Design a protein around this ligand. Structure first.
Ligand code: KDJ
Length: 167
């Protein structure tokens, strides 16, 4: 349902999510993608027209997707989905090359993400996507591998800005 919010500049879809950390900050909560059952990502979703701030969207999506309750302790700023469009696959032009580097052909981001760090206060056995997804705690190293395996570097950037212990 086209009830979603878009950047008036880049036309990118506005999304908010949470890097949910344990009190000791050794672990982060990850959910499984709905589409790709074996891919581990973090809670996030489209801002809706009613929502007065990114924090609202973020805490709602952390409930709906992960049955997680906690307090936002930090704004992790923005990261972007810079994945090229679908039609890119079989186009005549695909890359733009410099004398000292190579890059993908210029395009607007799919998604603009506003991330917060949440400290987990409770996890509930029942939530709206109870049976549609799985959820579990992971150390930094496992989370990092999960997000590379999911092909979501931008979610790893958001994770890297968090106070999660990397040691
Ligand atoms: O399908 C896409 N993105 C969808 C998200 O998939 P992932 O972010 O997991 O890759 C999905 O997230 P989950 O269902 O796995 O949780 C949810 O994105 P969102 O939760 O960040 O909004 C959904 O949105 P909805 O289906 O509307 O909930 C998004 O696709 P669209 O938002 O429909 O474009 C894509 F970007 F077009 P693609 O390149 O992955 O094909």
């Amino acid at each position: 349902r086209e009830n979603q919010v878009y950047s008036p500049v880049t036309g990118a879809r506005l999304v908010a999510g949470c890097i949910c950390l344990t009190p000791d900050k050794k672990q982060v909560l990850m959910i499984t993608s709905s589409a790709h059952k074996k891919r581990w990502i973090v809670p996030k979703g489209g801002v809706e027209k009613d929502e007065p701030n990114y924090e609202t969207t973020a805490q709602r999506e952390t409930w709906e997707e992960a049955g997680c309750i906690g307090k936002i302790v930090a704004n992790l700023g923005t990261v972007e989905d810079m994945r090229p469009p679908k039609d890119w696959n079989k186009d005549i032009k695909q890359f733009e090359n410099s004398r000292k580097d190579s890059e993908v052909a210029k395009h607007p981001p799919r998604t603009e993400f506003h991330f917060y760090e949440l400290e987990i206060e409770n996890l509930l056995d029942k939530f709206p996507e109870c049976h549609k997804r799985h959820r579990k705690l992971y150390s930094y190293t496992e989370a990092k591998q999960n997000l590379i395996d999911a092909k979501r570097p931008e979610l790893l950037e958001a994770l890297n800005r968090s106070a999660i212990i990397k040691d």
